[PDB]
Design an enzyme around this catalytic site. Structure first.
Site, PDB file in Angstrom:
ATOM      1  N   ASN A 294     -13.733   9.710  35.579  1.00 48.05           N
ATOM      2  CA  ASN A 294     -14.845   8.779  35.856  1.00 48.05           C
ATOM      3  C   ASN A 294     -15.125   7.702  34.790  1.00 48.05           C
ATOM      4  O   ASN A 294     -15.532   6.611  35.184  1.00 48.05           O
ATOM      5  CB  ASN A 294     -16.164   9.527  36.203  1.00 48.05           C
ATOM      6  N   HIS A 304      -4.142  -0.377  36.617  1.00 53.71           N
ATOM      7  CA  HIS A 304      -5.052   0.711  36.977  1.00 53.71           C
ATOM      8  C   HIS A 304      -5.707   0.508  38.352  1.00 53.71           C
ATOM      9  O   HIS A 304      -5.808   1.482  39.095  1.00 53.71           O
ATOM     10  CB  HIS A 304      -6.092   0.937  35.865  1.00 53.71           C
ATOM     11  N   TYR A 312      -3.614   6.935  44.525  1.00 54.54           N
ATOM     12  CA  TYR A 312      -4.631   7.981  44.595  1.00 54.54           C
ATOM     13  C   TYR A 312      -5.371   8.160  45.920  1.00 54.54           C
ATOM     14  O   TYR A 312      -5.420   9.256  46.476  1.00 54.54           O
ATOM     15  CB  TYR A 312      -5.657   7.743  43.484  1.00 54.54           C
ATOM     16  N   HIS A 339       7.318   5.103  34.933  1.00 52.25           N
ATOM     17  CA  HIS A 339       7.339   4.726  33.522  1.00 52.25           C
ATOM     18  C   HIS A 339       8.639   5.191  32.867  1.00 52.25           C
ATOM     19  O   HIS A 339       9.329   4.405  32.219  1.00 52.25           O
ATOM     20  CB  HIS A 339       6.142   5.322  32.789  1.00 52.25           C
TER      21      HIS A 339
HETATM   22  C1  3VV Z   1      -3.639  -0.567  24.033  1.00 47.77           C
HETATM   23  C2  3VV Z   1      -2.565   0.474  24.235  1.00 47.77           C
HETATM   24  C3  3VV Z   1      -2.990   1.872  23.859  1.00 47.77           C
HETATM   25  C4  3VV Z   1      -1.865   2.890  23.866  1.00 47.77           C
HETATM   26  C5  3VV Z   1      -2.081   4.068  22.933  1.00 47.77           C
HETATM   27  C6  3VV Z   1      -1.565   5.393  23.467  1.00 47.77           C
HETATM   28  C7  3VV Z   1      -2.640   6.441  23.678  1.00 47.77           C
HETATM   29  C8  3VV Z   1      -2.434   7.307  24.915  1.00 47.77           C
HETATM   30  C9  3VV Z   1      -2.632   6.565  26.194  1.00 47.77           C
HETATM   31  C10 3VV Z   1      -1.698   6.314  27.087  1.00 47.77           C
HETATM   32  C11 3VV Z   1      -1.209   4.961  27.483  1.00 47.77           C
HETATM   33  C12 3VV Z   1       0.267   4.937  27.864  1.00 47.77           C
HETATM   34  C13 3VV Z   1       1.003   3.678  27.436  1.00 47.77           C
HETATM   35  C14 3VV Z   1       1.960   3.126  28.479  1.00 47.77           C
HETATM   36  C15 3VV Z   1       2.365   1.678  28.257  1.00 47.77           C
HETATM   37  C16 3VV Z   1       3.069   1.037  29.442  1.00 47.77           C
HETATM   38  C17 3VV Z   1       2.867  -0.465  29.523  1.00 47.77           C
HETATM   39  C18 3VV Z   1       1.989  -0.873  30.679  1.00 47.77           C
HETATM   40  O1  3VV Z   1       1.354  -1.903  30.698  1.00 47.77           O
HETATM   41  S1  3VV Z   1       1.979   0.309  31.997  1.00 47.77           S
HETATM   42  C19 3VV Z   1       0.222   0.729  32.073  1.00 47.77           C
HETATM   43  C20 3VV Z   1      -0.007   2.196  32.412  1.00 47.77           C
HETATM   44  N1  3VV Z   1      -1.422   2.524  32.505  1.00 47.77           N
HETATM   45  C21 3VV Z   1      -1.874   3.759  32.723  1.00 47.77           C
HETATM   46  O2  3VV Z   1      -1.117   4.702  32.946  1.00 47.77           O
HETATM   47  C22 3VV Z   1      -3.372   3.958  32.678  1.00 47.77           C
HETATM   48  C23 3VV Z   1      -3.723   5.275  32.028  1.00 47.77           C
HETATM   49  N2  3VV Z   1      -3.765   6.368  32.989  1.00 47.77           N
HETATM   50  C24 3VV Z   1      -3.504   6.198  34.285  1.00 47.77           C
HETATM   51  O3  3VV Z   1      -2.367   6.043  34.721  1.00 47.77           O
HETATM   52  C25 3VV Z   1      -4.689   6.196  35.241  1.00 47.77           C
HETATM   53  O4  3VV Z   1      -5.675   5.282  34.793  1.00 47.77           O
HETATM   54  C26 3VV Z   1      -5.263   7.630  35.450  1.00 47.77           C
HETATM   55  C27 3VV Z   1      -4.531   8.297  36.614  1.00 47.77           C
HETATM   56  C28 3VV Z   1      -5.032   8.463  34.189  1.00 47.77           C
HETATM   57  C29 3VV Z   1      -6.759   7.587  35.755  1.00 47.77           C
HETATM   58  O5  3VV Z   1      -7.159   8.773  36.489  1.00 47.77           O
HETATM   59  P1  3VV Z   1      -7.656   8.613  37.983  1.00 47.77           P
HETATM   60  O6  3VV Z   1      -7.196   7.578  38.951  1.00 47.77           O
HETATM   61  O7  3VV Z   1      -6.428   9.435  38.166  1.00 47.77           O
HETATM   62  O8  3VV Z   1      -8.555   9.851  38.497  1.00 47.77           O
HETATM   63  P2  3VV Z   1     -10.129  10.058  38.619  1.00 47.77           P
HETATM   64  O9  3VV Z   1     -11.197   9.273  37.949  1.00 47.77           O
HETATM   65  O10 3VV Z   1     -10.011  10.987  37.461  1.00 47.77           O
HETATM   66  O11 3VV Z   1     -10.618  11.054  39.767  1.00 47.77           O
HETATM   67  C30 3VV Z   1     -11.399  10.526  40.853  1.00 47.77           C
HETATM   68  C31 3VV Z   1     -12.859  10.546  40.479  1.00 47.77           C
HETATM   69  O12 3VV Z   1     -13.140   9.427  39.597  1.00 47.77           O
HETATM   70  C32 3VV Z   1     -14.114   8.589  40.174  1.00 47.77           C
HETATM   71  N3  3VV Z   1     -13.771   7.204  39.870  1.00 47.77           N
HETATM   72  C33 3VV Z   1     -12.585   6.753  39.340  1.00 47.77           C
HETATM   73  N4  3VV Z   1     -12.577   5.452  39.177  1.00 47.77           N
HETATM   74  C34 3VV Z   1     -13.816   5.017  39.618  1.00 47.77           C
HETATM   75  C35 3VV Z   1     -14.398   3.740  39.692  1.00 47.77           C
HETATM   76  N5  3VV Z   1     -13.779   2.623  39.307  1.00 47.77           N
HETATM   77  N6  3VV Z   1     -15.658   3.645  40.181  1.00 47.77           N
HETATM   78  C36 3VV Z   1     -16.287   4.766  40.571  1.00 47.77           C
HETATM   79  N7  3VV Z   1     -15.813   6.010  40.536  1.00 47.77           N
HETATM   80  C37 3VV Z   1     -14.563   6.092  40.048  1.00 47.77           C
HETATM   81  C38 3VV Z   1     -14.115   8.905  41.666  1.00 47.77           C
HETATM   82  O13 3VV Z   1     -15.357   8.594  42.258  1.00 47.77           O
HETATM   83  C39 3VV Z   1     -13.831  10.407  41.653  1.00 47.77           C
HETATM   84  O14 3VV Z   1     -15.057  11.177  41.419  1.00 47.77           O
HETATM   85  P3  3VV Z   1     -15.916  11.735  42.670  1.00 47.77           P
HETATM   86  O15 3VV Z   1     -15.084  12.826  43.323  1.00 47.77           O
HETATM   87  O16 3VV Z   1     -16.148  10.558  43.603  1.00 47.77           O
HETATM   88  O17 3VV Z   1     -17.214  12.275  42.096  1.00 47.77           O
END
Ligand code: 3VV
Ligand code: 3VV
Lengths: 408, 408
Positions: A294, A304, A312, A339
Site C-alpha cells: 500500500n 509501476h 496484477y 528483468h
Molecule cells: C533509485 C533506484 C533504487 C534502487 C536500489 C535498490 C533497492 C532495492 C529495490 C529494488 C529495485 C530494483 C531495481 C531494478 C532496476 C531496473 C531498471 C528499471 O527501470 S525497471 C523498474 C522496476 N521497478 C520495480 O520493480 C518496482 C518495485 N517493485 C515492483 O515491481 C512493484 O512496485 C511491486 C510488485 C513490488 C509493488 O507491489 P504491488 O503491485 O505488488 O502489490 P500491493 O500493494 O502490495 O497489493 C495490493 C494492495 O495494495 C493496494 N494498492 C496498491 N497500489 C495502490 C494505489 N496506487 N492506490 C491505492 N491502493 C493501492 C491495493 O488497494 C491492495 O490493498 P487492498 O486489498 O485494496 O486493501
C-alpha cells in the site's frame, strides 16, 4: 479508482528546487560537482601533461550504431502500422457474424504470434546474431520491451470497450503517433495541451541531459574503469575484491543519482514540453518510501503503473478471490523473469539470482524501518546498508560474469 | 535599540525535520560513516595497520596543564575584580567632592584591569612558553571572551547609574556567574528557563561534538596534512601552490561545515541546554545572505551583536550621523584589528591583508548574487567563487607563512 489523471504537474524536483534552503543546497551540490571536475582536470593535467579525457569506453560500447538505428526504425514502423491496422480490421467487423469466439481466437492468435515472433524474436535475433556490444544492445532490448508494453496497452485499453456491447473504433493515426512518443505506457486519447512549447526550456533541458550523460561517463571512465582493469587482471578468488567493493560505493551513489536525474527528470520533461503532455509525475519521492504493501513510493512511476494495472489486476482476477499473496508473488515472478531476461540477454550472461536478492534486501530495509521505527539510528543504518549492500551484489555480479563464467 | 531574546531551536532543529531535508541529512551521515569505514579498510589492506594514530593532535594541544591553570586564573580574575570594582563604584556615586573625579580614578583602575590583567596576562603566558597553536587558540579565545563580557557588564550598568531617588541598580554576583557561562556577549539578567535540563539530549550533543571533532581531525590529517608538508618544503614556484589550491576544496568545505555544526550548533546547544538559556538564535541562514549595506545575515550572531551594539552605536554618538558610513569604516577597522590580533598572536605571523581581502571577496560575491539578479547561473558562480576563494587564499596565507617566514 482505476485509470489515469493529470492532477500532479511540472515535476517533484522543480517543486522543491526553488524553496530557499533546498535550492541553495542544490546550487552548492552543482558547485561541488563542477569543482570536482575542474580539480580532477587541472590536477591531472599539471601532473601528467596529457589532459587525457579518454573516449575509449563509449566508442566500443555503442559499437554498431547504424544497425541499432535501422532496427529501431523498422521496429517503430512495425509498432506504428501493424497493431493499429490489425485492431482496425478486427473491431469494425466483430459481431456482424461469428457468434462463437472463432473470429477473436484466430485474430488474437495472429496478434500474439506477431508480438512474440516479430517484436519478441526480431529484436532478440538481430542483437544476438551480430553479437551487439552491451550499450547498443541495451537500447534495442529497452526499446523492445517499451514497444511490447505500448502494443499490449493499445490492445488492452480498446479490447474491453468493443466487446461489452455502439462499437467504439480505433483512434486517429495522428493521435496514435503522439502516443508512441508520449511520456507514459498507459494508452489514452486524452492528453491536455499546455499553452506553448518553450524552445529555450527544451534547449536547456537537452543541455542538462547531455551534460548529466557526459558527467556520468566522465566519472565512470575516471573512477570505475581503473577498478574494472584491476578486477580484470586477477579476477578469480582474490580477497582484494574487498579493496574495490569498499572503493566503488561513493561513485556508485553518484552514478545512481545522476542517472535517475538525467533519465527520469531531464529527458522526460524535455520530451513532455515538446509534446505538451501535462502530467510530469515521472517519479515519486522514493527516499521517503517505507514498505511494499500500500505505501510503496516507486522511483519510476510509468513502469509501476503499467505493472500494477495490466499484470496484477488481471492476475487477482483469474487466480483466486482471496490468495492476494499468490497474486503479489506472481507480479514478483513476472517482474523477476522480465528483468533477469533483460539484464541476461543484455550482458551475455545467465544469472537469475540478482533481482530476487534485491527484493530480499528490500524486504530487510523495509522491515527495519516499518516497525514504527522513525529513530534516525535505524534510518542511517538503512541508508549505509543499502549503499554497501547494492555495491556488494553489483561487484559480485561483475566478478561472477568476468571470472568464473569467462574461464570454462 | 537594545537586543531582547524571543527565538528558539537554532535553525537546524526546525529544518532538518522537514522530511526531504531530514532524509538528505541521513544520506549525508550514511555517506560520512561509509567514507571513513571504507577508507579505513582500504588502507588496512594497502599499507598494513590503521593509518590514524593521532600524531599531530598531541603537538596541537601540548601544554594543556598550563592552559587549565591560566583558564582558572582568567575565570577567577574576571569573575571577581570587574564585579568588585563595579560594586565599589556603585554605592557611593553622587557623593564625591568633584563630580567626575571618582569615575576618573575608578574607570582608570578598570582599564588597568582590561589592558593589564586580561589584556596582557593571557597574551604574556601564551607568548612566554611559546604555546602550540591549538592550546594558544583556547587561551586567546577565552581571553577575548572575558574582555567582551567585562566590557558589556560595565557598558550595560554604567549608563543606568549615571543618568539622573534609586537611580542605580547593580545585579547579584550569582547571575554574573551564570552570564560568564551564557551563550551570548551582551550582559543581561533577562534569561528565561526551559522546563528542565534534558540529560539524554546533552549526552547526545556531547557525543556528537566528540564524534564531529574526531571526524574533522581524521579528514584534516589524511586529506590535507601530506599537502601541508609539500607547501612547506618547496613553496615558491607556482606548481605546488596551483596543485594545492585545486586539491584543498572538497576537504576544506567538509571541515568548514562540520566545524560550524560542532561549534555554532552542537556545542552552544549543549551549554544552552545545561543552562536552560531558551534563545538559540546562535546563527542566521548564511547561505541565503544577500548584501552588506542593510539586511546582512551573519553566520554567527553573538560577535555581530557585540560589534554593532558596542562600536557602531558609539561611533554614531562620536561623529554626527551625516558622516555615519565614513565613521563605521572604523567598525570595519575594529573587526579588522581584533581579528588580525587573534590570527597573528594565534599563528606567530603578522600578515594584515587576510581579513580585508576576505571582506572585498564578500563584497564582490554580494555584487554577483545581489541586485536581485537571482538567476541560478550567478548563484552557482557565487558558490564556486566562495569555495575556490576560501581554498586559494587559505593556501596563499599558509604558503606566505611556511615560505617567507621560515625562509627569509
Ligand atoms: C533509485 C533506484 C533504487 C534502487 C536500489 C535498490 C533497492 C532495492 C529495490 C529494488 C529495485 C530494483 C531495481 C531494478 C532496476 C531496473 C531498471 C528499471 O527501470 S525497471 C523498474 C522496476 N521497478 C520495480 O520493480 C518496482 C518495485 N517493485 C515492483 O515491481 C512493484 O512496485 C511491486 C510488485 C513490488 C509493488 O507491489 P504491488 O503491485 O505488488 O502489490 P500491493 O500493494 O502490495 O497489493 C495490493 C494492495 O495494495 C493496494 N494498492 C496498491 N497500489 C495502490 C494505489 N496506487 N492506490 C491505492 N491502493 C493501492 C491495493 O488497494 C491492495 O490493498 P487492498 O486489498 O485494496 O486493501
Ligand atoms: C562560514 C564563513 C564563510 C566565510 C566566507 C568568506 C566571506 C567573508 C565573510 C566572513 C568571514 C569572517 C571570518 C572571521 C572568523 C573569526 C571568528 C568569528 O566568529 S568573527 C565573525 C564575524 N565577523 C565580522 O566581521 C562581523 C560581521 N561583519 C560585518 O562586516 C558587519 O556585519 C557590518 C560592518 C556589515 C555591520 O553593519 P554596518 O556597520 O555596515 O552598518 P550600517 O550599514 O550602518 O547598517 C545599519 C542600518 O540598518 C538599520 N538596521 C535595522 N536593523 C538592523 C539589523 N538587525 N542589523 C543591521 N542593520 C539594521 C539601522 O537602523 C541602520 O539604518 P540608518 O542608516 O540609521 O537609517
Amino acid at each position: 479508482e482505476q485509470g489515469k489523471i493529470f492532477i500532479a504537474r511540472r515535476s517533484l524536483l522543480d517543486e522543491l528546487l526553488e524553496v530557499d534552503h533546498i535550492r541553495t543546497i542544490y546550487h552548492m551540490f552543482i558547485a561541488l560537482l563542477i569543482l570536482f571536475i575542474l580539480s580532477t582536470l587541472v590536477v591531472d593535467y599539471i601532473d601528467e601533461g596529457r589532459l587525457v579525457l579518454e573516449f575509449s569506453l563509449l566508442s566500443y560500447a555503442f559499437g554498431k550504431f547504424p544497425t541499432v538505428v535501422w532496427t529501431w526504425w523498422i521496429m517503430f514502423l512495425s509498432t506504428f502500422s501493424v497493431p493499429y491496422f490489425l485492431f482496425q480490421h478486427w473491431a469494425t467487423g466483430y459481431s456482424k457474424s461469428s457468434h462463437p469466439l472463432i473470429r477473436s481466437l484466430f485474430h488474437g492468435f495472429l496478434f500474439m504470434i506477431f508480438q512474440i515472433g516479430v517484436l519478441g524474436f526480431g529484436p532478440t535475433y538481430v542483437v544476438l546474431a551480430y553479437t551487439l556490444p552491451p550499450a547498443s544492445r541495451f537500447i534495442i532490448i529497452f526499446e523492445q520491451i517499451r514497444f511490447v508494453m505500448k502494443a499490449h496497452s493499445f490492445v488492452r485499453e480498446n479490447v474491453p470497450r468493443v466487446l461489452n456491447s455502439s462499437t467504439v473504433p480505433i483512434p486517429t493515426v495522428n493521435q496514435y503517433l503522439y502516443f508512441l512518443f508520449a511520456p507514459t505506457l498507459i494508452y489514452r486519447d486524452s492528453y491536455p495541451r499546455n499553452p506553448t512549447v518553450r524552445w529555450g526550456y527544451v534547449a536547456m533541458k537537452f543541455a542538462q541531459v547531455f551534460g548529466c550523460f557526459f558527467y556520468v561517463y566522465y566519472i565512470f571512465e575516471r573512477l570505475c574503469a581503473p577498478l574494472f582493469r584491476n578486477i580484470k587482471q586477477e579476477p578469480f578468488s582474490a580477497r582484494v575484491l574487498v579493496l574495490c567493493v569498499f572503493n566503488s560505493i561513493l561513485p556508485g551513489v553518484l552514478i545512481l543519482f545522476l542517472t535517475f536525474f538525467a533519465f527520469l527528470h531531464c529527458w522526460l520533461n524535455a520530451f513532455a514540453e515538446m509534446l505538451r503532455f501535462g502530467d510530469r509525475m515521472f517519479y515519486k519521492d522514493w527516499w521517503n518510501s517505507t514498505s511494499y504493501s500500500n505505501y510503496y513510493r516507486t522511483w519510476n512511476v510509468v513502469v509501476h503503473d503499467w505493472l500494477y494495472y495490466y499484470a496484477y489486476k488481471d492476475f487477482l482476477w483469474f487466480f483466486s478471490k482471496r490468495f492476494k499473496s499468490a497474486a503479489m508473488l506472481a507480479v514478483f515472478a513476472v517482474s523477476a523473469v522480465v528483468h533477469e531476461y533483460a539484464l541476461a540477454v543484455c550482458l551475455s550472461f545467465f544469472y537469475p539470482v540478482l533481482f530476487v536478492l534485491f527484493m530480499f534486501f528490500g524486504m530487510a530495509f523495509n522491515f527495519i524501518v516499518n516497525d514504527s521505527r522513525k529513530k534516525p539510528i535505524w534510518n542511517v543504518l538503512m541508508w549505509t546498508s543499502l549503499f554497501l549492500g547494492n555495491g556488494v551484489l553489483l561487484c559480485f555480479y561483475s566478478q561472477e560474469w568476468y571470472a568464473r563464467q569467462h574461464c570454462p
